[PDB]
Amino acid sequence: VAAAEKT
Amino acid sequence: VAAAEKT
Amino acid sequence: VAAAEKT
Amino acid sequence: VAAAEKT
Amino acid sequence: VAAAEKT
Amino acid sequence: VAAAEKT
Amino acid sequence: GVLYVGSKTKEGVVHGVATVAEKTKEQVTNVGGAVVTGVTAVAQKTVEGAGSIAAATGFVKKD
Amino acid sequence: GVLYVGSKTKEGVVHGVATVAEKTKEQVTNVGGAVVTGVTAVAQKTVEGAGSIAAATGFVKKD
Amino acid sequence: GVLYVGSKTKEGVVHGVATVAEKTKEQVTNVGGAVVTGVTAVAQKTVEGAGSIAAATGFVKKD
Amino acid sequence: GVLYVGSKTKEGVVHGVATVAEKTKEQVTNVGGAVVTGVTAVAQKTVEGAGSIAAATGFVKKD
Amino acid sequence: GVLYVGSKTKEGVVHGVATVAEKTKEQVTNVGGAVVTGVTAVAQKTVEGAGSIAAATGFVKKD
Amino acid sequence: GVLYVGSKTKEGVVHGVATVAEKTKEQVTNVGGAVVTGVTAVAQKTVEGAGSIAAATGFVKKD
Amino acid sequence: GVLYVGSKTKEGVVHGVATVAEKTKEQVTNVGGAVVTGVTAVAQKTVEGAGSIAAATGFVKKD
Amino acid sequence: GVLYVGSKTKEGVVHGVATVAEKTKEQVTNVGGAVVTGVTAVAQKTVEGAGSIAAATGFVKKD
Amino acid sequence: GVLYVGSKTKEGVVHGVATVAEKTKEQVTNVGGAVVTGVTAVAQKTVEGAGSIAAATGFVKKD
Amino acid sequence: GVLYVGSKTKEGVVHGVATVAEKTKEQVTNVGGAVVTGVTAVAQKTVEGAGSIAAATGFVKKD
Amino acid sequence: GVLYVGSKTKEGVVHGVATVAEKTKEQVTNVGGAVVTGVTAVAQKTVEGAGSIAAATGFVKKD
Amino acid sequence: GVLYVGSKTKEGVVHGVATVAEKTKEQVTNVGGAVVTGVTAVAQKTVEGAGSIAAATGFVKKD
Amino acid sequence: VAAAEKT
Amino acid sequence: VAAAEKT
Amino acid sequence: VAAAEKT
Amino acid sequence: VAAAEKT
Amino acid sequence: VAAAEKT
Amino acid sequence: VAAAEKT
């Protein structure tokens, strides 16, 4: 599981 | 599982 | 499973 | 599990 | 488990 | 477990 | 009399390569796969085994 | 009389490489995978085994 | 009489490499994977074993 | 009479490398993986064993 | 008569490397993984064992 | 007559390296992992054992 | 309001040049004259005067 | 309002040139004259004066 | 308001040049003249005067 | 308001030059003249005067 | 308000030069003349006077 | 308000130079003339006077 | 005057 | 005057 | 006057 | 006057 | 006057 | 006057 949001 | 959103 | 949305 | 948000 | 937020 | 926030 | 066996060969050689790459902006975005870029001026020899340059496999699943 | 076996060879050789790269902005974003960049002027030999340069595999799953 | 076996060879050699890299901004972001960058002027030899340069695997899962 | 076996070889050699890198800003961000950068002017030989340069594995999980 | 076995070789050698790196700002941020940077002018030989340069593994988990 | 075995070799040698590094600001931040920087002009030989230069492992968990 | 006079110009600029010259044998023989060779990657500006690059005059005689 | 006079120009610029010259044997023989060779990637600007690149004159005689 | 006169210019600039010269044998023989070789990566500006790079005059005679 | 006169310029600048020269044998033979070799990475500015780089004159005779 | 005259300029600057020269044999033989070799990474400014780099004159005769 | 005259300039500067010179044999033989060799990493400024680097004159004769 | 014989 | 013989 | 003979 | 013989 | 014999 | 014999 991986996540990488740019906001 | 992977995710990578740019918002 | 992979996802890659640009918004 | 990893996470890396830029806000 | 890892986390790395820049805000 | 690791955490590394820049605020 | 002289015998040459497998001799004076060149096998897997690169020479005399000039390269210029002006690129204002490069972006790689990779999710869950493999990406290979820019492999330049590479030379290889194998004996008795498989040999790969810049090969990519997105994933291997064998459940 | 002279015998040469496997001799005077060049095997896996790189020479005389000039490279310039002006790049104002490089970005790599990698999630859960593999990225390989910029592999330049590489030389290899193997004997009795597989040889890989710039190979990438995104994941191996064998549950 | 002279015998040469496996002699005077060049095997896995790099020489005479000039490189310039002007890059105003480099960013690598890696989550949960492998990233390899910039491998330059590398030479290897192996005997009786697999040899890898700049190889990347994102993960290996064998639960 | 002379015998040469495995002699006068060059095996895994690098010489004569000039490199310049002007980079105004480098950033590496790594979460939970492996990053390898800048590997320059490297030479190796192995015998009877696997040999890796700049190899990266993001993780190994075997629960 | 003369016998040379395994003699006069060069094996794993680096010489004549010039390098310049102007970098206004370097940042590494590492969380829970491995980062390798800047490995320069490295030479190695092994016999009867695996040899690694600049290898990185993010973690090994075997619960 | 003369016998040379394993003799006059160079094995794992570095010489003639010039390096300059102008860096206005270096920062390393490491949480819970491994970071390796700046490994320069290193030479090694091993016999009968594995040899690692600049290897990094983020952690090893075997509960 | 803004005025730019003679501004933001590029005037006599060279950048991003890669050149390789493998030449097994160069000979110059000069008797009583001028020889110019190899002028590479040269940039000049003059103001209020004649400008010459790689100019050759074999002799000037004004008895 | 903005006025640009003579601004943002490029005047005498060269960029992005890659050149390779393999020449087994070069010979120059000069007797009593001028020879110019190899002028590569040259850029110039002049103001208020004559500009010459790679000009050659064998002799000037004005007795 | 802002005025720029002669400002932000580049005038006589060279950057990002990689050059390699493998030459097994160079010979210069000069009798009674001028020889110029190898002028590389040169940048100049003059004001109010003649400017010359790699200029050769075999002789000046004014008896 | 701001005034820039002759400001923020670059005038006679060289940066980021990598050069390699492998030359097995150099010979210069000079009799009664001038020889100039190898001028590399040179930058100059002059004001109110003539400026020369790598200029050669074989002789000046004014009896 | 701000005035800049002749300010923030770069005038005659060299930076970031890497050079390697492997030369098995150099010979200079000079009889009665001038020889200039190897001028590398030189920067100059003059004001109100002529400026010369690597200039050579074989002789000046004015009897 | 601020006035800058001739300020914040760089004028005749060299920095960040790496040089390596492997030369098995250097010979200079000079009879009756001038020889200049090896001038490296030199910076100069003059005001109100002629400035010379690596200038050679074989002789001056004025009987 | 100039001359250049190869013999 | 110049001369350059190869013999 | 200049000369350059090979003999 | 200059000379450069090979003999 | 100059001479430079190689023999 | 100069001379430079190699023999």
Numbering used by the authors:
A (entry chain j), B (entry chain g), C (entry chain e), D (entry chain l), E (entry chain n), F (entry chain p), ...: 16 to 22
G (entry chain E), H (entry chain G), I (entry chain J), J (entry chain L), K (entry chain N), L (entry chain P), ...: 36 to 98
Manuscript text:
To investigate the interaction between WT αSyn and ATP at a molecular level, we turned to cryo‐EM and solved the structure of WT αSyn amyloids in the presence of ATP to a resolution of 3.08 Å. The high‐resolution structure of WT αSyn amyloids in the presence of 1 mm ATP also shows a type 1A‐fold, as expected since the ATP was added after fibril formation. Interestingly, however, there is an extra density corresponding to the N‐terminus forming a β‐strand involving residues 16‐21. Furthermore, there is an additional density for ATP in the cavity between the two protofilaments. The ATP density is not fully resolved, and thus its exact orientation cannot be stated with certainty. The diffuse density rather indicates that ATP binds in several similar binding poses dynamically. The cavity in which ATP is found contains several lysine residues: Lys43, Lys45, Lys60, as well as Lys21 and Lys23 (predicting its position based on the partially resolved residue 22) in the additionally ordered β‐strand. The sole histidine in the polypeptide, His50, is also deep inside this cavity. The additional β‐strand in the N‐terminus of one protofilament interacts, in the same vertical layer of the dimeric amyloid structure, with the ordered core of the other protofilament, resulting in a peptide loop enclosing the protofilament interface cavity and adding a β‐sheet to the overall cross‐β structure. The following plausible mechanism of catalytic action emerges: With an induced fit mechanism, ATP binding to type 1A αSyn amyloids (anchoring at K43 and K45) recruits an additional β‐strand comprising residues 16‐22.
